[PDB]
Point group: D4
Chain length 181, copies 8
């Protein structure tokens, strides 16, 4: 079992359902949450951020693509395209905005938001897909400076991100986590 | 039991309460969900669409007529008429709009929305009853181009409709379903 | 047990919690729901109408006085007066409007709303207390034509009132109920 | 166990979860709710007021600092500061307003709101932290006359405060409670 | 809706799940619980008796055949036969005794248990199927005087049966019910 | 509200459902739990003892008569008599023993069990009804020295009775309670 | 998604938690429940049989090894060995009998129980591990003719096994399933 | 917060309610679960063992003293003494056996059960109090070789104890824990 203590923190810090979705996502890609425990903390973080993001705005505003199984996520991605007319993205996005009619790619990075946004923008060729990056320091960067949600909703996500960083720094796990991305 | 596999898909694809309401509705009209399984999938679909439709808008906006028993649905249809003054419709409608003061007939078709709207409009003589048609392809057609709900609420219904079509096409049940209406 | 069948209808027509509150209210005033079964149906009706009324509007808009015990209802009536400055009403009202700063007396009558409003207005001397009457036929009458809630919220109450009347007429209990007020 | 009857009233008057949070807060500071029962009633009162306060406004508007453990409350206080840029307060505040970008110190006093606000303002050196005082008589005083929430939300808190006072006066516990602050 | 008051008593006297199973059983056989209300009370009674019967004895002692759908009940009846070797009964029984290896036919009659047992024994040709009759007066008659369960379990069923009779006699519905079998 | 502190202890010491049943029982007999608070503690105590008593023994062993409404309790008392043949008791008993075929009168006294048993035996003329007395000191006395349940079940009731006495002595309410029977 | 209809039957026939445990077990071994759907039905069947098996007997009789994750199942297998002294089995067993002090290997086969027992006995070298085989036809074979549980508990498992076979035969999936082991 | 990783393991290994009871027990004695984390794991372990111990045997067999607050635990200890006649123990015990009429002191040690039993027996002067020691290795020692419960119930406790030891050894926390008692 290796007994990694980053693993015990992830199970105590995150929601049991978020932990289970992160485990299924990693195992589907041939990754062990017990071995690649720094990632394990990252999919949980990215998953939670995606969920609070969809919690912002109206009730029927967002369609959640992240967290589903690969086949089901691509099925919903299709149905959105064949009903609105948006182009099918090359890579699986995180959300869909029914209010702005675009897919959203949510990013959570340990470095400056400038580089990660560049890597995210260079990966996707469909420039229509909206990009929204968050950082553990409290920064954010969105496409065309369009941050989609309200300031209070984005502030809650930043607060949670910094709380996670503090809890890992208290357990001396932050240095390894930052130097793993 | 015939062992129809359209039946197993309906039970796995739809909500248990929606399946139970569709079964009671079919049996009340002398129809077997185990035999007329293409219909069985259609009442479930029509039922779900009616429910998400009422989920759009405000909390007290819609009165749900579809899904009730025949006697109870006609009792509520009455009470709405004897309190607002709207004319009693000849056939049982699906919803009532407290905001626009009209009954809504929700349609879900496998062909072009043009024909089905014509059949729905020719059936009812009370032209006051509002008609709103949806299609599995992603089209919609409403009376006087008044689509009642927001675009995001209607888009969610279209996305779900196309997801159902994909799941049946994956199980090779879509061709029989489309050629049954 | 007398075996009155109006009693069985009240238990089947109304919510179990509403039935229990009506029973405690009647017993507190020395009345048997098993004997005075026409009243029993009326306190349940009045109770439900009061509850849907408070369900209209915003979340913190209304304070519910009806349904509480006599001592507790007068305690809350006080606290509202000693904090807002409104005069203490002589008789226990049903609600309090934090938005309009007034107590509301809800009426549900079997005759024309004109007479019942007159009896309700002649009873209270505090003309500041707002009066809102409903009828089983679908009429309503409020003080200064100020109906407080939205039209859709009031329409839902009227629809429910007429549904109750129909269910009793089907059981031949409506004639006795109307001739009891 | 001393058998103080102020203790039994607190357990009957307040929510079980609010009582448990008040007990943990007192024990953390080396105080016995069974001995210092007048305080015990006050932390419960202050806790409830803080909770209804956060219930006002939008869903993601307030971050709740009061009620958490000391280390966790300071962790969230940090994360809010390192993400918004607000100065770290010297003493632990009660809430944080994501809408106005400020910490809120909620006060509940048994005397005139004028003195308590002065003591609260003299304690904190960070004049940016917003102060909102409530009284058991129905008064309130906020920094710069900015009362943050709606009138109806604040009125509900005042009504509850006066209800608590009445319930203690009925049990002859109000005189000791007022002369303990 | 006919407004039969036997119907309202059945809905108030019996469990909501038992009422729903009785309604599905009657509708499956082309019977209206709103019209044939004396039967409606009888399937509910027979259903409840069958359920308390299986509640007697050990946990895994009885397999419940009554209450299931016709196809599913015959499927379980088969599986019991193809695993134990018991002969397939001609008519659907109520229970199966894993302890005594026999099917049980439960009877609830309004006349003397002697006649009903004779009619039940003449109907089935498989003399291996055990017969257990109950009466509303407090009598019981079982095959070979083998009453299967304990005396206390059977006494509880008799007590409930007489309670149902009293509740109907109080509502003047007992005379019609007894003269309907 | 009188603000009696025996009342607050009863609400904190006993189960919410037991408190509600005791309140309905007292109000049915024209007694105020807020005024006759020493009784209020006694019906709760007697009610709880009756419930733990039925919790002893097998699952279907006891029929609970105490706690029901007067008409319903007499209905069940009848059905037990018309099915087993036991004589109808003159006064309402507490339980019925399906194992020993007798009604049980449970007593909870503040004096010696000798006197209370004599008063209980002189009240009832049906000597068949079993009598079982408990005391707050830890004594018990049953008819024909037949204590019905196991020693461990009766010991749990005695322990609970002495715990209640201690909690009242700590609040200085025991002296008034003992001198009220 | 392949749209296999054996998959839809497994999801409708088995418990949602049993389906989830079977999916995790297959994915852990690099198997797709959507592709190897005949297996998918078998792990669900084997899982359910293991669960009903542990449901037989006393409450603390069995320790469940099957269904856990590989590392956790081996951890519990150890703790049982290091506390009772039983030899560590070479392969992961299904249960442990605290009453007989032995591990149990549960088998569910589509052929005669004779061959499968031979394959199961030849696989394990620890002859101390008890073997209990079940068949879809209604047969069973246990080590030393020691069938561990009662006849009624084993009969329930056989009945369920034959019910599963019938449901697949009705959907024409039984022939492929039997010819896959 | 110190960020001790023994703390994270305790929160992941033990039940949330057991963790909360251990935290209240430590804080009551002036101990920090965040600092004295080796103890923190021990009170959780001792608490769980006490709970499974009471889960063995009949339903009303054991009275649970451990886990309660100090005043309440001594209140129940009294009531047991003043009703059965057993002598009041000098130190708070863990359980009470209604079947054997004695208090039980449960021990969980990291060394040989011989020494710990001696320390436990030398501490208490009331030789009537029964002593039952468990070890993380799988040993147990009880007074007069009377192990109270069944072998299967005690074996489950031993298995759980060894599982806890393995989980800590995997996280390299076992060496510090054993060298802390
Ligand atoms: C729908 C359901 C799960 C949703 C995920 C998401 C979780 C949501 C839960 C809410 C309640 N809150 C808020 C407070 C705590 C809590 O619990 N939040 C948001 C914050 C963290 C969290 O947990 N939502 C949104 C709709 C309801 C729901 O639960 N998902 C998973 C991926 C796709 C999807 O829509 N589904 C769908 C099928 C499988 C499944 O599980
Ligand atoms: C009221 C009740 C049933 C309602 C039908 C409808 C179902 C609603 C459930 C909601 C919650 N969501 C949303 C997320 C999943 C879920 O579950 N949605 C909407 C989406 C699909 C669905 O299921 N609604 C609306 C009010 C509450 C409720 O449940 N119906 C049935 C016909 C009449 C009616 O009003 N009733 C009334 C008596 C019998 C009964 O069952
Ligand atoms: C607060 C609680 C009871 C409330 C009465 C009222 C009932 C409300 C329930 C809601 C949910 N809906 C809506 C759908 C069905 C349902 O159930 N509605 C409204 C419609 C009918 C109904 O039932 N509300 C409002 C707040 C939450 C709640 O339940 N009351 C009783 C008198 C005072 C009061 O505030 N209280 C308070 C202490 C005792 C008690 O019971
Ligand atoms: C989040 C949770 C507790 C929250 C405290 C607060 C309590 C809230 C409960 C709501 C529901 N209502 C309203 C009706 C009755 C009720 O119950 N209200 C408000 C009124 C009184 C009350 O009780 N809220 C707000 C979010 C959901 C929730 O419960 N707290 C405690 C301190 C930090 C915090 O956010 N947490 C967080 C982890 C530990 C815990 O317990
Ligand atoms: C299994 C389930 C329903 C069972 C019927 C039966 C009902 C049982 C409920 C128990 C709990 N008690 C007792 C106190 C009140 C209550 O509620 N009792 C017995 C007394 C009246 C009653 O209601 N049982 C037994 C197992 C669990 C359960 O519920 N049935 C229905 C027919 C087949 C069957 O096994 N099933 C199975 C699939 C559909 C469904 O609904
Ligand atoms: C049946 C139901 C109430 C029962 C009373 C009785 C209460 C029982 C509850 C159990 C669970 N435990 C035990 C742990 C805590 C708890 O809660 N115990 C026993 C100890 C104290 C207590 O509370 N029982 C027994 C059957 C299930 C049930 O609840 N009563 C009330 C009078 C008649 C009757 O049978 N009924 C029936 C209709 C109205 C109602 O409420
Ligand atoms: C403990 C828990 C799951 C258990 C598996 C097992 C399931 C049990 C559920 C019971 C209730 N019934 C019976 C009626 C329907 C139902 O639901 N049955 C038995 C029949 C089918 C079924 O489902 N049991 C037994 C203890 C309680 C429980 O649930 N398992 C899974 C593997 C290890 C284990 O002990 N655990 C443990 C941690 C993860 C998890 O999930
Ligand atoms: C009564 C209640 C708590 C009890 C403690 C104990 C916990 C019990 C829970 C059971 C269910 N299981 C078993 C499976 C998982 C689970 O959860 N087990 C046993 C194993 C671990 C566990 O958790 N029991 C026994 C009665 C019901 C109950 O819960 N306690 C705490 C100290 C005194 C006491 O009696 N009380 C009483 C008032 C405060 C409180 O909390
Ligand atoms: C090693 O590869 C994987 C991928 C997944 C899901 C991929 N699908 C996404 O959509 C995805 N992944 C990531 C991401 C991460 F969460 C951790 C590390 C690196 C990443 F790129 N960030 C996103 O923002 C995102 O949208 C799960 C497990 N392992
Ligand atoms: C075979 O007849 C039936 C009818 C009902 C309910 C009828 N009442 C409606 O209200 C209704 N029916 C249908 C509909 C359908 F769902 C499937 C096929 C054909 C249809 F017309 N579409 C609607 O939109 C609608 O409102 C149930 C079972 N069988
Ligand atoms: C016989 O007297 C009573 C009174 C109460 C509550 C009185 N308090 C009110 O507040 C109240 N009562 C009534 C009302 C009614 F519900 C039925 C008949 C006559 C009425 F006036 N209508 C209201 O609108 C109202 O507000 C309960 C039982 N019996
Ligand atoms: C004796 O000291 C303590 C302090 C705490 C929490 C302190 N932290 C706060 O934040 C806090 N305390 C108080 C407060 C009170 F609730 C009662 C008496 C005096 C007070 F100042 N009023 C607030 O408004 C507030 O924000 C808990 C127990 N004992
Ligand atoms: C009109 O025919 C039906 C039959 C059923 C179920 C038949 N299957 C049984 O198994 C069954 N029926 C009856 C029974 C009854 F419940 C009421 C009247 C007459 C009866 F014979 N008594 C039993 O004991 C029994 O086992 C449902 C509706 N209508
Ligand atoms: C003032 O009269 C009442 C009577 C009832 C219920 C009567 N029915 C019983 O069955 C009953 N009553 C009492 C009892 C008591 F609980 C308190 C004081 C005196 C008593 F005799 N002890 C029993 O043991 C018992 O069985 C409720 C309220 N007030
Ligand atoms: C540092 O002192 C404490 C004591 C308590 C509860 C004492 N009451 C008992 O009853 C108790 N304590 C312990 C025990 C332990 F769990 C850990 C270390 C040493 C111990 F002796 N083992 C038992 O078996 C037992 O019955 C809580 C916190 N700190
Ligand atoms: Mn993604
Ligand atoms: Mn992303
Ligand atoms: Mn319709
Ligand atoms: Mn329609
Ligand atoms: Mn009123
Ligand atoms: Mn009114
Ligand atoms: Mn504070
Ligand atoms: Mn404050
Ligand atoms: Mn039958
Ligand atoms: Mn009694
Ligand atoms: Mn196996
Ligand atoms: Mn202890
Ligand atoms: Mn101990």
């Amino acid at each position: 079992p290796r007994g990694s203590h980053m693993e015990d923190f992830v199970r105590q810090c995150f929601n049991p359902m978020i932990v289970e979705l992160a485990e299924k996502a990693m195992k589907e890609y041939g990754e062990d949450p017990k071995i690649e425990t720094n990632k394990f903390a990252a999919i949980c973080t990215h998953l939670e951020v995606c969920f609070m993001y969809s919690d912002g705005g109206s009730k029927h505003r967002f369609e959640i693509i992240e967290g589903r199984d690969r086949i089901m996520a691509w099925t919903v991605v299709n149905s959105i395209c064949n009903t609105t007319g948006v182009e099918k993205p090359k890579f699986l996005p995180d959300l869909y905005d029914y209010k702005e009619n675009r897919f959203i790619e949510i990013g959570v990075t340990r470095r400056e938001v400038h580089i990660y946004y560049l890597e995210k923008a260079n990966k996707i060729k469909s420039e229509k897909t909206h990009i929204h990056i968050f950082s553990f320091t409290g920064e954010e960067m969105a496409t065309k400076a369009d941050y989609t949600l309200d300031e209070e909703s984005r502030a809650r996500i930043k607060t949670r991100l910094f709380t996670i960083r503090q809890e890992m720094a208290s357990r001396s796990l932050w240095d390894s986590f930052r130097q793993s991305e």
